[PDB]
Design an enzyme around this catalytic site. Sequence first.
Site, PDB file in Angstrom:
ATOM      1  CB  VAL B  20      -1.005   0.103   1.217  1.00  0.00           C
ATOM      2  CG1 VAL B  20      -2.138   1.165   0.927  1.00  0.00           C
ATOM      3  CG2 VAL B  20      -1.543  -1.312   1.654  1.00  0.00           C
ATOM      4  CG  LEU B  83       6.405  11.495  -9.354  1.00  0.00           C
ATOM      5  CD1 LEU B  83       6.839  10.083  -9.096  1.00  0.00           C
ATOM      6  CD2 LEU B  83       6.601  11.866 -10.817  1.00  0.00           C
ATOM      7  CG  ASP B 127       0.371  -3.786 -14.786  1.00  0.00           C
ATOM      8  OD1 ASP B 127      -0.608  -3.978 -15.611  1.00  0.00           O
ATOM      9  OD2 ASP B 127       0.101  -3.544 -13.587  1.00  0.00           O
TER      10      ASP B 127
HETATM   11  N1  ST8 Z   1      -4.095   9.852  -8.303  1.00  0.00           N
HETATM   12  C1  ST8 Z   1      -3.413  10.127  -7.086  1.00  0.00           C
HETATM   13  O1  ST8 Z   1      -4.082  10.457  -6.115  1.00  0.00           O
HETATM   14  C2  ST8 Z   1      -1.912   9.954  -6.872  1.00  0.00           C
HETATM   15  C3  ST8 Z   1      -1.255  10.816  -5.996  1.00  0.00           C
HETATM   16  C4  ST8 Z   1       0.088  10.649  -5.749  1.00  0.00           C
HETATM   17  C5  ST8 Z   1       0.826   9.620  -6.335  1.00  0.00           C
HETATM   18  N2  ST8 Z   1       2.163   9.519  -6.020  1.00  0.00           N
HETATM   19  C6  ST8 Z   1       2.845   8.381  -6.103  1.00  0.00           C
HETATM   20  N3  ST8 Z   1       4.183   8.440  -6.109  1.00  0.00           N
HETATM   21  C7  ST8 Z   1       4.925   7.310  -6.230  1.00  0.00           C
HETATM   22  N4  ST8 Z   1       6.265   7.386  -6.260  1.00  0.00           N
HETATM   23  C8  ST8 Z   1       4.233   6.011  -6.339  1.00  0.00           C
HETATM   24  N5  ST8 Z   1       4.872   4.793  -6.479  1.00  0.00           N
HETATM   25  O2  ST8 Z   1       6.081   4.746  -6.487  1.00  0.00           O
HETATM   26  C9  ST8 Z   1       2.774   6.048  -6.321  1.00  0.00           C
HETATM   27  O3  ST8 Z   1       2.067   4.890  -6.306  1.00  0.00           O
HETATM   28  C10 ST8 Z   1       0.646   4.959  -6.285  1.00  0.00           C
HETATM   29  C11 ST8 Z   1       0.119   3.641  -6.785  1.00  0.00           C
HETATM   30  C12 ST8 Z   1      -1.388   3.644  -6.617  1.00  0.00           C
HETATM   31  C13 ST8 Z   1      -1.884   2.264  -7.014  1.00  0.00           C
HETATM   32  C14 ST8 Z   1      -1.413   1.923  -8.439  1.00  0.00           C
HETATM   33  C15 ST8 Z   1       0.091   2.094  -8.654  1.00  0.00           C
HETATM   34  C16 ST8 Z   1       0.476   3.502  -8.258  1.00  0.00           C
HETATM   35  N6  ST8 Z   1       2.162   7.232  -6.209  1.00  0.00           N
HETATM   36  C17 ST8 Z   1       0.191   8.742  -7.217  1.00  0.00           C
HETATM   37  C18 ST8 Z   1      -1.178   8.908  -7.462  1.00  0.00           C
END
Ligand code: ST8
Lengths: 253, 297
Positions: B20, B83, B127
């Site tokens: 998560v 990000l 993916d």
């Molecule tokens: N839409 C959104 O709300 C948002 C805000 C922030 C965000 N940021 C961020 N940064 C990462 N470095 C990262 N994985 O490495 C990650 O995984 C997030 C996961 C979520 C489940 C699928 C794979 C990606 N998220 C991403 C999304």
Amino acid sequence: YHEDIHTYLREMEVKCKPKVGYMKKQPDITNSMRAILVDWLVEVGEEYKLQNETLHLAVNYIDRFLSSMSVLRGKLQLVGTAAMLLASKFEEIYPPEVAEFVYITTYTKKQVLRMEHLVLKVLTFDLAAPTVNQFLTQYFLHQQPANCKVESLAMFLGELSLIDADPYLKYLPSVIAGAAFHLALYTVTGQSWPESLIRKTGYTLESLKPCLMDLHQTYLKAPQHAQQSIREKYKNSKYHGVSLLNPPETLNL
Amino acid sequence: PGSMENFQKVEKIGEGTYGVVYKARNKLTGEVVALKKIRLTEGVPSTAIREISLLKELNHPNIVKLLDVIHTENKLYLVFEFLHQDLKKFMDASALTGIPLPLIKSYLFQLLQGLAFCHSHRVLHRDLKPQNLLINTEGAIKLADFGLARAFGVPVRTYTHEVVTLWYRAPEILLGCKYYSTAVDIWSLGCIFAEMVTRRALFPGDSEIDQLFRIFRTLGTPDEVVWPGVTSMPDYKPSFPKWARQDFSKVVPPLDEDGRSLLSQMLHYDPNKRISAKAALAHPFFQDVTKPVPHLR
Ligand SMILES: NC(=O)c1ccc(Nc2nc(N)c(N=O)c(OCC3CCCCC3)n2)cc1
């Protein structure tokens, strides 16, 4: 991507190389106890029909772990089990389950899992190590034409090298793979380390020579060695029963 | 180098391939990070093993950066750079505006850079989809979620079959070829390129045959001419309806000539003729490319 990958692997294999001396620094274990362990790993791989890459990776993990951790002989197998577990988890589509590893060894499941985590820490998770197998497979693409016995014989000799820390710890995967490839192709067809591989690798029969002499000995002495799982394994049709072929008596180098 | 004690958890973000992800800040440096939290009986899951060891090797401005692994005996924590959102959520927000061409161009270009780098380092992502492509406020897009990735060999051998989210899954996997390669990641990118332009999935199938047939109805059913070996592939059926190929200018109507040329190379049936990420970078589609900041948020 063939050249980029080969270049990248040539760089990693240096960074992923175990300490050549390590066994002299181990109070309680010897080259010969490592050979027993590796020979056993070969059996595990055949029992569970694991890829040859998997075995190669395990041996890389064990040598690296043993390069910096001092281990008692009662634990050497624990390390090997976890190494093989991690290699399976990395490399296989269907890794054996923890239970199957507990069963082949006794140590508890808790021990195996704790060791697994220890090995990850000690290796700082760097598991994507180059192997003799990854090099050979690339070298194979230079056969004209492809010959199955050459491939299997090369794999056999490459594998044989896992067993003996002395001398093979001193050579890099890409070098052993070159000796193996030449040795195999010579034994089977009379042909030599080809021109195109000189262009790719930069290695010649001259640079290969040292390892090649060791390999040629290992080959000739193979029926006599205290460890035999590889010879047994390579009687199988799957590997074209190459381990029944006769070693050449001389190399003409 | 890290310790959980220096991170303040800020909000849950979501659930990707495993574990998560939460947004969090480092109390001492100020840095916003994403923490992936892995509950640890098979011990460490193969996905985490793969993701961690491969991400350690891949340091590239268009691959999400693994900063640290905090390694308790109960819990494993991956600290990533933060990000701001993903491509899917960005496409939704552009719902009315559309995404401006120079942003599509920049993102595709950047995506091809990150992929090229992965392929160059013998890694398959397997993916690629909008939810796993993350954007920042400075114009970067980055490949994330490497839980499904793997280290390949040259030449490849048989790897897992159940692979790539359906909508983005290449025909050679759908047709059960025993060998697949880097070209599968390109297919996904091609699909996403289409998607960034139309703001809707190119092949939104609900099952593997529905997926093939949607692909077939757009690119025409492939035969031995277009793709030698097809009719011999394990899941190929002689009974497949045989659809005429559609003119690309109708597949993605807003796309210009260079765009279309590119997408068609990205969507060639035969993996061997499908363009590489490396080659795609020099395509005339990208000749005027820049890196604008995202027109939103
Ligand atoms: N839409 C959104 O709300 C948002 C805000 C922030 C965000 N940021 C961020 N940064 C990462 N470095 C990262 N994985 O490495 C990650 O995984 C997030 C996961 C979520 C489940 C699928 C794979 C990606 N998220 C991403 C999304």
